[PDB]
Amino acid sequence: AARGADFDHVYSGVVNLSTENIYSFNYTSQPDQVTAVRVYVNSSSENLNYPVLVVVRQQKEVLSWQVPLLFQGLYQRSYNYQEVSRTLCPSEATNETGPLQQLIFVDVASMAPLGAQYKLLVTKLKHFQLRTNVAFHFTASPSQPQYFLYKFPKDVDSVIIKVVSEMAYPCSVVSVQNIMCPVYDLDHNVEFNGVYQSMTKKAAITLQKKDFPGEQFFVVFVIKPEDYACGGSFNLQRKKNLEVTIVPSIKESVYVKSSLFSVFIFLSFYLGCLLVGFVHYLRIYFWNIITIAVFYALPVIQLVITYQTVVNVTGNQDICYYNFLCAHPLGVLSAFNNILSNLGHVLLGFLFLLIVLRRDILHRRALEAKDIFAVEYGIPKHFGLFYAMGIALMMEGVLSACYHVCPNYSNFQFDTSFMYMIAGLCMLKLYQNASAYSAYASFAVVIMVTVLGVVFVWFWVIFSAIHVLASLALSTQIYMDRMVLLVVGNLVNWSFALFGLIYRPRDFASYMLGIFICNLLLYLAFYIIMKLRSSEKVLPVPLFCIVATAVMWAAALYFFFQNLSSWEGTPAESREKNRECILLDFFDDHDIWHFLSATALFFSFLVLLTLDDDLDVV
Amino acid sequence: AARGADFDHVYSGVVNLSTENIYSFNYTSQPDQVTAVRVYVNSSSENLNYPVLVVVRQQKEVLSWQVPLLFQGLYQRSYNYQEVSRTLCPSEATNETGPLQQLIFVDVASMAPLGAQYKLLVTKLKHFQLRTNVAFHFTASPSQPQYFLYKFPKDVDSVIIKVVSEMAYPCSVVSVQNIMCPVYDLDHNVEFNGVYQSMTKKAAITLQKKDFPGEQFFVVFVIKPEDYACGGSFNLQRKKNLEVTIVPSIKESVYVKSSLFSVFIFLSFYLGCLLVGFVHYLRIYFWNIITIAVFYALPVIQLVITYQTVVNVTGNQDICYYNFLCAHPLGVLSAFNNILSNLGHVLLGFLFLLIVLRRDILHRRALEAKDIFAVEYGIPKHFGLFYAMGIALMMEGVLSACYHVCPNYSNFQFDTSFMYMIAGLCMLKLYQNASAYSAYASFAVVIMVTVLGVVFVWFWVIFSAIHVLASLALSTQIYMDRMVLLVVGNLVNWSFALFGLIYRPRDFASYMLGIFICNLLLYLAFYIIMKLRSSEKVLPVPLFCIVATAVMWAAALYFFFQNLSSWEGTPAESREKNRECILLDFFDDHDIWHFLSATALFFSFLVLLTLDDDLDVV
């Protein structure tokens, strides 16, 4: 019992308590290509107490739905849609089997005393297979989910899928499943299997060839009914216009050609320092700091790899905050362009403990043999702080090379934490004890207290008075021309504190921008303009070094001020600010800061070291 | 078109490509009680290429399934079941509406050239509603999931649901949903809504009355096909015999009657000390430790409340490791019997800084006025360690009262961490500097290194030699009778290290059991048997105190040696060892250790303080 209907035609009729509508669609497959049937069903109006029930029977599948669809959300609201569409599964073919005959049965029924109205349209899909470097243009809906198929090529072993929306809204979920057919297109079971990502404007998924049996996969797009998870708020139709692009990945030569550059650019400094040095006349407090440094590192190297294993096991790519367009994977690590750029700290913090140790050896030898108290400058024994300076670079580099494996909220902002100490020591600038030893750990304690309290009684307005008092206390000791300069510096610090209180950009995230002014104040106390009535204190090598650290600090602020990701306000809003890669397709735009910060801090420390000349001969 | 069949009868027949089987069941509801229809369908044999498809149509629901069910699991295995059963949703009634007429349509069809065989049985449910303090006896299966209904009483505002299996296997999931009917009984969508727990032998769920609209809820039981998540391994039938019990919760009077006891039991010590004291003759290193103590606490009080909020938001009760039969909730906190028992540390660490400060004041006054160098015992100025002893109790109590909000793996075992320092100081026992200051932080560094390295090259065998060397080094300084005692102690320590290496009970969890021997060695060096040829050094008050700290250390080891939970080997195996509550239905069996450890450590420290008598008059 059937009617023998034909494909691509609009059918209408009346259903009742006894009348049932039967349709039978017969089609022949091919020994190649993929076909995909699609059923669209529309209801006229009303029907909120006696809906229409449609069942579709295949050889190895039965599907069923009611036409007046009713969703449900938070805060006791009810949405109702009146249009249903579905994409039936394919059957596939082989080269050893001929053409296949297939039958689809569609039954429509209702349970109403008077009747209902329905419209049926069953059509084949012409464009079902995505190709390499070809962009599509479809349109989704919260009651019309979509899926497509992709086949791996013979040479490509990895693919990046890029999905781009247009306006802002509504949110969606994208999934990557393997080639079977208990296919999951409903919203409540879309997260059961496969890599899935929430997206509101952008999405990027990285896939490999060795993890898929048969080298074919399904990309599934589903639209969220209520945009609550993405951070926003909130009947007739929603609609969405997406765009999907598949691109290949880089080869293996780039992984060598970039690491060779990033390990052959920091030996020219060694060669230069050697050349400059060997041309002359044509020729236990530290011990009690390692035990504290090995206390504040082991929770990081017990939490980070655990989080990485959790992300690499459960499937959810919503726990870490990477840059999803420039995250190259290697091995267990999923970001191998933010762990090889931190190799500058632990290699440029080793030229201090080859020069200042030689200077210590030479000065102690000169004290042992010659009379070092003749024509000297104010107790020449001055070291012991350079050894606690040139090891904080390594203890900042090792601590920075463990945060970029999973940026999250538990790890907080523990990357620019010891840099506050490295820029706020300001002890060796008081050259030529009681209030310094106590304030050494107290400075880092106050910095950590401010960092913790920045997130949580008018913190912005309360900090201006404390900053002004601290600036006045510092300028009282540092400092009439000197009094006028101290007053101008205190006024500038108060104006900067008032401007920061007026701004209040990103609360705890703005702690870096608020302590950059403190670092500038600490690094603007260069007294090189003392030559009004004093000695010369100027030489070509410190003049070149102060020119270099004046020039090379301007460039290192631009890449700081370009924001790429964000650790606040949902994990689906980081993807909007994502950017691509420059400089040989390996380095990011928040990865040329770890190359300039180290080589500016090293030159500033060298300026601090090599200064106070033209007095050893007096 | 129908046949007019009757309830509770076995029907059989043959289906084909053209023949379809229709059944129509008409039933009348009642103005009270709950009915529940249940459909059982059985297939004879074979049918792996042409299955049987069954659809059930109601007024506001359509359900559909194939009879030769096929599941799927990891490692490319395929299971097939031949029996299906389902429980249809109820329709419910009101007191303002009369009896309701309902019709169920059951259609059976196939797509086979020869035929298939099927058996249908549709029956009503007699026992559908659970009652208070009544235990049921049902039987589940991985292809037969179950659900029941419960209604809140008029006085009870909270309920504990206890589910108990029998043997070990197989695992299951239990869910608590609200009263609607898009009911979720399949395995892939059971975790969409509601509180759910994985269970293999035991489960306990706590529910409240203010969170459920209408005061009715659904308890859903579903059996897992593959027992992989619970930790185990791995066709005809599985089967499971459960048991469910609903019990009420305690009143509000217990929350007052226990806190009054647990704050009125620790003032009798104050009254006793006052009475003993006022009866006589009828009458800056510490400053540099607060800055380090406020460094190792803020990640805990940024991670713990975040984890608690995550558990209290997402629904998953599988991230923290509580005792699910003795976890009383109050407010945001879900365990208010492990945060009010840690109030003993921060209240019994305050009787030292009222007695030793008075002794310091009296001794300084006596030095200022009288000649304190007459008839004294070896430089009577001895304090400065009691002030670093009586504040580690508070810095262990505050650090212990933040781990019991969510025991997990990231928090590790950071509860008995400063107790290693508190028991391994052993500095003031060398009475009457160079190697002590260096070894102070080094002892805690070695303890933290051992704790970290215990989890991860024959650690058990390598530690015996290090322990023997450390024991020999300690006994060389501490210590012929003294040499024989030192040799016997070194031999006993080597035997204990060999026994611990032979045992190796729980690796990193066994670090507490392996350092308990070290604590016993440090607290067994009491030289009170020096009276062979020496002075008396014995008085009634230190004799009573050494008797008390000898007696009250035996009882505090039993409750340690009773294990209640475990932080390793899946989060569904902690529930097997769970126990109930003793001592006025509030305190646990791992909560009478925080009351005896403090009052034994305080008496041991008092023994250390008050000793060396009978020499102030000589």
Numbering used by the authors:
A (entry chain A), B (entry chain B): 42 to 275, 286 to 334, 443 to 591, 598 to 621, 626 to 648, 681 to 819
Published text:
SID1 (systemic RNA interference-defective protein 1) is a transmembrane protein involved in the inter-cellular transport of small non-coding RNA that cause systemic RNAi. In humans, there are two known systemic RNAi defective transmembrane proteins (SIDTs) - hSIDT1 and hSIDT2 – that are implicated in hepatocellular lipid homeostasis, glucose tolerance, insulin secretion, tumor development, cancer chemoresistance, RNA translocation and degradation during autophagy, and activation of innate immunity. The transporter classification database categorizes SIDTs as α-type channels (TCDB: 1.A.79), belonging to the cholesterol uptake (ChUP) or dsRNA uptake family of transmembrane proteins whose function and stability are regulated by cholesterol. The emerging consensus on the function is that SIDTs are cholesterol-dependent dsRNA transporters with a divalent metal ion dependent lipase activity within the transmembrane region.
Here, we use single particle cryo-electron microscopy (cryo-EM) to determine the structure of heterologously expressed full-length hSIDT1 at ~3.4 Å. As ChUP family members contain CRAC motifs, and are believed to be a cholesterol transporter, we excluded cholesterol and its analogues from our purification buffer to obtain the structure of an apo-hSIDT1. We used HEK293S GnTI− cells for protein expression, excluded CHS during solubilization, and purified the protein in digitonin for final sample vitrification at a sample blotting temperature of 18°C. As a result, our sample is apo hSIDT1 that lacks complex N-glycosylation and is vitrified at higher temperature and pH. hSIDT1 is a dimer where the protomers are related to each other by a 2-fold (C2) rotational symmetry, with the axis of rotation being perpendicular to the plane of the lipid bilayer. Each protomer has an N-terminal β-sheet rich ECD (yellow box) and a C-terminal all α-helical TMD, which can be divided into two parts – the TMD core (blue box) and the lipid binding domain (LBD; gray box). The β-strand-rich ECD adopts a double jelly roll conformation, and two such double jelly rolls, one from each protomer, are juxtaposed in a C2 symmetry to form a dimer. TMs 1–4, along with TMs 10 & 11, form the TMD core of the protein, and TMs 5–9 form the lipid binding domain (LBD). The TMD core is stabilized by four tiers of evolutionarily conserved interactions – the TMD-ECD interface, the TMD disulfides, a metal ion binding site, and a phenylalanine highway. While we observe density coordinated by H563, D574, H791, and H795 in our structure, due to a lack of convincing biochemical evidence, we have not modeled a metal ion at this site in the structure. In SIDT1, we notice a similar phenylalanine highway within the pouch formed by TM1, TM3, TM10, and TM11.
